[PDB]
Design a protein around this ligand. Sequence first.
Ligand code: HEM
Lengths: 78, 378
Amino acid sequence: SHMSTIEERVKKIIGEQLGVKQEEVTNNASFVEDLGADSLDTVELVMALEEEFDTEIPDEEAEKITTVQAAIDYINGH
Amino acid sequence: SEFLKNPYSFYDTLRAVHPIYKGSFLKYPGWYVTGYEETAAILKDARFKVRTPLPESSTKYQDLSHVQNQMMLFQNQPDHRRLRTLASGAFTPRTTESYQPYIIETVHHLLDQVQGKKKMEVISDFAFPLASFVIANIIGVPEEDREQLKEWAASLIQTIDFTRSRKALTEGNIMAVQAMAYFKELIQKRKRHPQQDMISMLLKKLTEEEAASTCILLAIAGHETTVNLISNSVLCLLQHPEQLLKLRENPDLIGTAVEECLRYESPTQMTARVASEDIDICGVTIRQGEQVYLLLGAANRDPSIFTNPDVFDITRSPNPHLSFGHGHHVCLGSSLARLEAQIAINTLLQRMPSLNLAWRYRPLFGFRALEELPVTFE
Ligand code: HEM
């Protein structure tokens, strides 16, 4: 057992939001194409990540993030 | 916080770039329209369609989505005309004028409760109770169930705003269940025993769920926006004591004064459309599927239509503001809203000869709504 890593925290959020298992979320998976996120899901995902990691993502940067790895990569910075 | 205190400086910066501005605010990308001519043209154009404020096929908030999607405000052809025509009977000039006695008597009753106190909160003591009493009376909601309506309205209005959260939408879904269940029950009673109200008029073609969502829509509109018009107008006049003296000395100026209050501090700051095809306007191309956000308060400050647009002038004539929208979806209850505001403000100024200010705006971007408005008098 261990404390939640950055990756585990990101994937739990995505899983709870999109109704998929936290295992089933792969790092290279696209939110819209692979995971099936609609035009509300993606907004609520950013909100959830902002809340979880106590950060503020500008609309410019959020537009860049389209895959799970990109979300993880952004949080490891910033 | 700085945006809420003065959004018009923000609108001005967008307008200087382009009256149709491509950008993204609060994570919502699209075209943000600050120009008057552009706003009016888009609202007039049926190619720019209304749409559900949550994704069409989303069942995350299943009950909230169902309630919203049945409302005429988010419906296009041919369902829009059907729904609008059926509800229109309660808001005709003639029927609206017949509400005047009840509005005058309610206004006096509410001011009686505070007359001796030398102090009041304009929203809680005056603006809200009036608007709540009037709309509940028109719809046919019993006086015992009036407080429950207030809670539903305040919760459901947030579900359409940019400032909405996961928590607000979850709360919204619960209130959607409650409101729909209540109006279905009230419809069953009116089916057996019709009364002199709008529910009965609706039942006299429309499903019982479409009637319920119609009632919910009118209940929210009757509460939220009309309350804001009254309270915004009072603040406006008190911040400009010089056309408040002027309206006090001549109550016949109430008509043109209310219109300038509508232009200057519009209760509704935003509405929205989606492009159903590729559309060329004002030297830009809006592609199919892209979202268009019409900033009505910004359009009302367009210096090419209103000279010295940041000046509050109650003698402005005419006043072709867009506060009630434009085109097919133009406000259904605009006559009622105007009447409530006219009577409320004129009577207040008559009965409180020495009215003075003792401010915070609610965290809504699509609406300009005060948290409270404490005043003193006599
Ligand atoms: C009891 C008072 C009110 C009632 C019953 C009411 C009702 C309605 C209804 C049913 C619609 C939908 C019409 C349609 O889709 O065809 C509508 C539209 C609209 N209302 Fe009102 N309303 C009220 C007050 C107000 C106020 C005070 C304002 C702001 C000054 C306002 C602003 C608007 C706007 C801008 C639209 C059109 C929005 C769009 O085109 O997307 N309403 N109203």
